[PDB]
Amino acid sequence: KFAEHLSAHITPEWRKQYIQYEAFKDMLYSAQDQAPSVEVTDEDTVKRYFAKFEEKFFQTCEKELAKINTFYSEKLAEAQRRFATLQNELQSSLDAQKVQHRNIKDLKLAFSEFYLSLILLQNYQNLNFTGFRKILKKHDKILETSRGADWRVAHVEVAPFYTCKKINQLISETEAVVTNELEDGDRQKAMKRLRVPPLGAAQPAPAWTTFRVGLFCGIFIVLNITLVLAAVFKLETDRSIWPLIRIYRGGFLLIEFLFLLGINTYGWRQAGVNHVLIFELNPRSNLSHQHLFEIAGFLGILWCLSLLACFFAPISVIPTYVYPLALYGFMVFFLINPTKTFYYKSRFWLLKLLFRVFTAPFHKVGFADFWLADQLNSLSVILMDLEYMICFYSLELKWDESKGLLCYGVRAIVQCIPAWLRFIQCLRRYRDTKRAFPHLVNAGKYSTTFFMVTFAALYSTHKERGHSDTMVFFYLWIVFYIISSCYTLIWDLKMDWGLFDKNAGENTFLREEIVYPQKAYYYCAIIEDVILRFAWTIQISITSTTGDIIATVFAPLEVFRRFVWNFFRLENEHLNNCGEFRAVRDISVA
Amino acid sequence: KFAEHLSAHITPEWRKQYIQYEAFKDMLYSAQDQAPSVEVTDEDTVKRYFAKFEEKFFQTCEKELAKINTFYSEKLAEAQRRFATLQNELQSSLDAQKVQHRNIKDLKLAFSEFYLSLILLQNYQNLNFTGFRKILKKHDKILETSRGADWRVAHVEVAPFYTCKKINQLISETEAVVTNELEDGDRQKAMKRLRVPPLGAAQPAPAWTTFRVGLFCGIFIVLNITLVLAAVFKLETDRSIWPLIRIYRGGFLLIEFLFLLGINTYGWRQAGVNHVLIFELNPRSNLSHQHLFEIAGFLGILWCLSLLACFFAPISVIPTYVYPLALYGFMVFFLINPTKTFYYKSRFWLLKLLFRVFTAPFHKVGFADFWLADQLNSLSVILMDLEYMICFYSLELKWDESKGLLCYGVRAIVQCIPAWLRFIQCLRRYRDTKRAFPHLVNAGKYSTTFFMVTFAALYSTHKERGHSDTMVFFYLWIVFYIISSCYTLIWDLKMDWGLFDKNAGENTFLREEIVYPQKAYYYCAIIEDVILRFAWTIQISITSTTGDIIATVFAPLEVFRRFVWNFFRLENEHLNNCGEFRAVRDISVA
Ligand SMILES: O=P(O)(O)O[C@@H]1[C@@H](OP(=O)(O)O)[C@H](OP(=O)(O)OP(=O)(O)O)[C@H](OP(=O)(O)O)[C@H](OP(=O)(O)OP(=O)(O)O)[C@@H]1OP(=O)(O)O
Ligand SMILES: O=P(O)(O)O[C@@H]1[C@@H](OP(=O)(O)O)[C@H](OP(=O)(O)OP(=O)(O)O)[C@H](OP(=O)(O)O)[C@H](OP(=O)(O)OP(=O)(O)O)[C@@H]1OP(=O)(O)O
Ligand SMILES: O=P(O)(O)O[C@H]1[C@@H](OP(=O)(O)O)[C@H](OP(=O)(O)OP(=O)(O)O)[C@@H](OP(=O)(O)O)[C@H](OP(=O)(O)OP(=O)(O)O)[C@@H]1OP(=O)(O)O
Ligand SMILES: O=P(O)(O)O[C@H]1[C@@H](OP(=O)(O)O)[C@H](OP(=O)(O)OP(=O)(O)O)[C@@H](OP(=O)(O)O)[C@H](OP(=O)(O)OP(=O)(O)O)[C@@H]1OP(=O)(O)O
Secondary structure (H helix, E strand, O other), X not given: OHHHXXXXXXXXXXXXXXXXXXXXXXXXXXXXXXXXXOOOOOHHHHHHHHHHHHHHHHHHHHHHHHHXXXXXXXXXXXXXXXXXXXXXXXXXXXXXXXOHHHHXXXXXXXXXXXXXXXXXXXXXXXXXXXXXXXXXXXXXXXXXXXXXXXXXXXXXXXXXOOOOOOHHHHHHHHHXXXXXXXXXXXXXHHOOOOOOOOOHHHOOOOHHHHHHHHHHXXXXXXXXXXXXXXXXXXXXXXXXXXXXXXXXXXXXXXXXXXXXXXXXXXXXXXXXXXXXXXXXXXXXXXXXXXXXXXXHHXXXXXXXXXXXXXXXXXXXOOOOOOHHHHHHHHHHHOOOOOOOOOOHHHHHHHHHHHHOXXXXXXOOOOOHHHHOOOOOOOXXXXXXXXXXXXXXXXHOOOOOOOOOOOOOOHHHHHHOHHHHHHHHHHHHHHHHHOOHHHHOOOOHHHHHOHXXXXXXXXHHHHHHOOOOOOHHHHHHHHHHHHHXXXXXXXXXXXXXXXXXXHHHOOOOOXXXXXXXXXXXXXXXXXXXXXXXXXXXXXXXXXXXXXXXXXXXXXXXXXXHHHHHHHHHHHHHXXXXXXXXXXXXXXXXXX | OXXXXXXXOOOHHHHHHOOOHHHHHHHHHHHHHOOOOOOOOOHHHHHHXXXXXXXXXXXXXXXXXXXXXXXXXXXXXXXXXXXXXXXXXXXXXXXXXXXXXXXXXXXXXXXXOOHHHHHHHHHHHHXXXXXXXXXXXXXXXXXXXXXXXXXXXHOHHHOOOOOOOOHHHHHHHHHHHHHHHOOOOOHHHHOOOOOOOOOHHHOOOOHHHHHHHHHHOHHHHHHHHHHHHHOXXXXXXXXXXXXXXXXXXXXXXXXXXXXXXXXXXHHHHHHOOOOOOOOOOOOOOOOOHHHHHHHHHHHHHHHHHHHHHHHHXXXXXXXXXXXHHHHHHHHHXXXXXXXXXXXXXXXXXXXXXXXXXXXXXXXXXXXXXXXXXXXXXXXXXXXXXXXXXXXXXXXXXXXXXXXXXXXXXXHHHHHOHHHHHHHHHHHHHHHHHOOHHHHOOOOHHHHHOHHXXXXXXXXXXXXXXXXXXXXXXXXHHHHHHHXXXXXXXXXXXXXXXXXXXXXXXXXXXXXXXXXXXXXXXXXXXXXXXXXXXXXXXXXXXXXXXXXXXXXXXXXXXXXXXXXXXXHHHHHHHHOOOOOOOOXXXXXOOO
16 A cells, blocks of 8 residues: 555655665564564563663654754755745746747746645655655554654644645645736646646556557567568568568667667656656656557558568569558658647647757757767668668669669768767767766767777778778778777766766665666677677668678677667766655746 | 546446535536626615525535435345345354355355445445535535535534444454455455456556557558558459458458447446456456457458468468468467456466357356347357368369469358247246246247248258249248348347337437436437347348359448447447446355
8 A cells, every 4th residue: 555655656766765664664563573472581671672662662763853953944945045036037028028938938837836845745744744654654553652652642643844834835825826827817828837646656557548658569560570470471582581671670760669668658757767857747647658659650650561561562563662662651740740730739839849959069969969969879771671661662762663662971971960960969078067977978979889880891891892902991990899889888887877886885786876776787788789789789880881791690690789778878867856856847938 | 626526536327416516616606607787787686686596506415415315224234234244154154164165165255245345335425425515515615605604513423424434443343354254364365356446437447558459450450451452452363362351351241340349338427337347357357448458369360461471471381371370270269268367367267258148048148148148149250250260271272383373051050050049048037037028028029030040951952953842942041041040130229229118208219317428329329239139130141142342342231230239239228237237246055
């Protein structure tokens, strides 16, 4: 009932302030078990044990409450100190109208993001009180006394965290001020923006969505079995399937990315590392994991069906080079669907992000656009494809005949588009912050992947012609390979993940604190990301030299290191947004 | 928020006693809209309108509360009157031990079924109070006054339904009496049987189960598309598919039965007609609709795959006459799985039911075994199959050759096994109750389906030989056809469904009350069950004369009338278990 209820309804950034139910329960249960004797020893000696612990208990309760109200009052002062500046800012603004649209618009994200601190603090008044009357009721049950219940009336509801009705009156003035100065009355349009819906792991998946995740993962399994059958029967021929996989690798890397990003969003929501505060999403509406599994499953059904139509060749009139085109025209029409349907706010946010990353020297660099520029250094085969598959229909495809599928620059550069993106983003972080370690470095990390592709291509072109200036360039590519491997594997474990810290202490080789449940995950991953970081630099070289057989088998694997890396790049982030207790974004009105 | 919360957490049998939130809200909203004028008319005249309604409101509130405590106290007295007899019964029992196992066992279903009346009445104290402070808070919000909030302290929490702390002390004595005299202490094994889990429409489907319902309905859709393809391609031949469908019709009628029974359980749970009190299930643990959709989907995957293995003929060693056998050996092994896994209590209850119906002159006739003896008068083709498919492997199958499928009594009687079952059950109802209308009649209903099969078979056998005694028997089958059609279509609308009642009133041609939301469902069904009750008597005759082409197309359709009939046979039941307010079973200890 509660221990779970409390370990779920808790605000992650504050976990070191709640009642610590588990320790209490364990203390009580251990105490009862280590009872001296039922009647074997003397009577009053049994009392001692059932006394000494009683003294210990109410003592640790005392310091326990002492934490709450101290933490509580401190948090409250913050709110008070907020409703101060957050109000005069409106005051100045109000008269100023006689960018104002913008100024008004950002202001409502100040209050809406204020009224989420309070109503996340109000919970802290209840989630403790009715987490303070439960634990006591076992103490009065286990020992079968009443001292606990009495102490509950002796200290708890006299203490300034349950009998301090200040937060509620703050809630009342914010909702009459927002109502009055933001929505021209119309309280209904104000308590639609302000209301906070039960968030965290406390929102179950809307049954229909778990169903649809069941369906699109259902059609998908049979479609995969049908592919594995038919590619071991129907396809059989003398025709080259290398165009077929060289075109159906893009969709696959992009499906294996969204299933894994779904598992990422779940492994974040459950383990407490909030992927809401960091990305700057709005904490009332999100995409829980199920929606990601569902989008991934859907695009997976589309991918499977296009492949099957290519192999089974279902209708004679449509040549065969139209199924891949239809599939990839849908996988990108779904993303620019200009209605307000099928994840409208979602795709619109993602599009704003892409536009602030695919042209990102100019715009600021948040965390969303520093993250989805390290999801493009792994799906970097979906770009050499959307180069190959675009050159191929243009200059190689035979439009005279219905049988289709069964393309000096472009590859070398297009392989380093995302590395260039991130190099520029880090230079921009520098040119604003004025701090080198860590912005100028962490811009080298990508300068190397420039001095790998270039030198590998030089060796390639000078071995194709087979000239004297070839072995020299190869000695250069091989000496820059170890560079662009270590200088990105040390950075993958020291500053991103944050592991290997002197404050490690008990956590052998790890960080001082670890958010994720077990202690073998970190070691498994610290081995994996070491293996799979050498077969991504090769994977870069080979698919740039003068190959696809190793590409289509290392591409689906790189995305796995990106998945196992998201866990820790978001942990090591949250657990730097935890030491300062920050449950709500600081929004700025200008 | 509440109107729904209240229209869901409500105890169906008591719906005519709750606060009637919707009428209140509508009254308030209409009142505010029909306000005389904002300032157009005179000031104090606006007061009149905002006064007259104020007087009206508190008046209808007054009679509203007057209903609750009167209903409440009356319900409480019942509980008190219970804890009386329900206790001395234990008292007498206690000393008697010095069938006792049985006597003890039935006694715990007396308390567990008692402590569900209280904790369904306790809710009635909260679900009203915090349904009495909401409605008022809109009245004080809409009119923007405080009279409502004051009246709340003037009448509500002085009234003997919120300040009557008697039910809770009853809960305390029942759980210390059960703890002490049923479980030898061991409070943990008593508050495992007594606890009531949030029931009704208030229990969401356990996410994993909605997922699995998504999966087994996912593999199923592609498997059906593959069947429709392959039976329009792979099967093609000169071999007779009549054995193939004459064997794969059983599984289909049994799948189309469980999907539809799932839709039945949902249409019951949602529309309020409880399928829990009537079947005598235990109200804490049930099978919500999702579990039925999931079992149906699973047996559907098995059916589809067996069919596909028959058509695709996947492995050469296993002849082809082994796939239907494997499918139907699994569909019946799933039902006698002697572990405690895969719906253990469920299948064990269903098996106890079958054993109390397939031999049912002797056992009592509850409602479960009167209901699942009218689910066997529709799945009556699954018996002429398990006759045909059993005779065929025995005396027709060619075990010498691997190619298999591509069998004077038995049919005539086996068609009337379930009609015989129900005829006997009604005779047993008579031989106990001693009442004819409705037991002796409603035993005729099945005597006719005896004088239809018999006479149709007589005409058949005398036309095969083609003798003089043929046209006479046909004039008899045709005169008993209209009998066995009208005498079961009038009974399908007058006593089962209960429709066409003189107390109809406003509900044209219907019953006085209707539990189901709309008013076109009843007419649609009253037309349907008229059409599909003539093509079930034919369907009986044809598949008994000397055919399958019309059988395999009317069998999947009869089950539809059984589905559309379950709705109303359970409505017309619940809405006779509602007039007496009975939310808990009366269990008897002997
Ligand atoms: O909050 P965002 O930015 O994520 O999205 C909302 C915001 O968009 P935007 O500011 O234009 O980027 C407003 O748009 P807008 O043009 O109407 O007005 P402004 O541009 O804000 O002046 C808002 O209206 P409003 O609340 O300001 O009146 C609402 O409009 P719409 O859908 O038509 O819904 P209604 O408002 O008509 O019900 C938008 O969507 P939703 O929130 O889902 O409804
Ligand atoms: O209540 P039912 O009839 O629907 O089912 C229970 C009841 O069955 P039955 O009376 O035999 O028909 C008891 O069986 P039983 O033989 O143990 O004892 P009795 O025959 O009742 O004397 C009960 O144990 P118990 O609670 O009485 O000790 C429990 O057994 P089991 O798991 O071994 O129980 P635990 O060891 O986990 O308690 C059965 O299932 P569950 O309730 O799901 O567990
Ligand atoms: O009577 P029992 O022994 O069968 O059950 C206990 C009962 O409290 P009771 O006995 O009435 O005082 C539950 O509260 P309840 O629903 O009555 O609610 P109210 O308090 O009455 O509102 C309580 O949940 P909780 O809500 O306090 O957390 C539960 O804790 P459980 O979830 O198992 O474990 P935790 O998560 O608590 O550690 C207790 O079981 P045990 O832990 O074994 O003692
Ligand atoms: O602030 P607003 O005006 O946007 O919203 C109102 C708000 O009460 P508030 O304003 O504080 O007085 C809700 O209660 P809440 O969460 O505050 O709960 P507390 O009681 O405060 O704990 C109330 O639900 P609820 O009162 O039935 O639980 C809701 O009615 P709606 O959902 O339609 O539910 P019904 O009308 O169908 O019942 C009201 O909206 P409108 O009906 O449009 O006026």
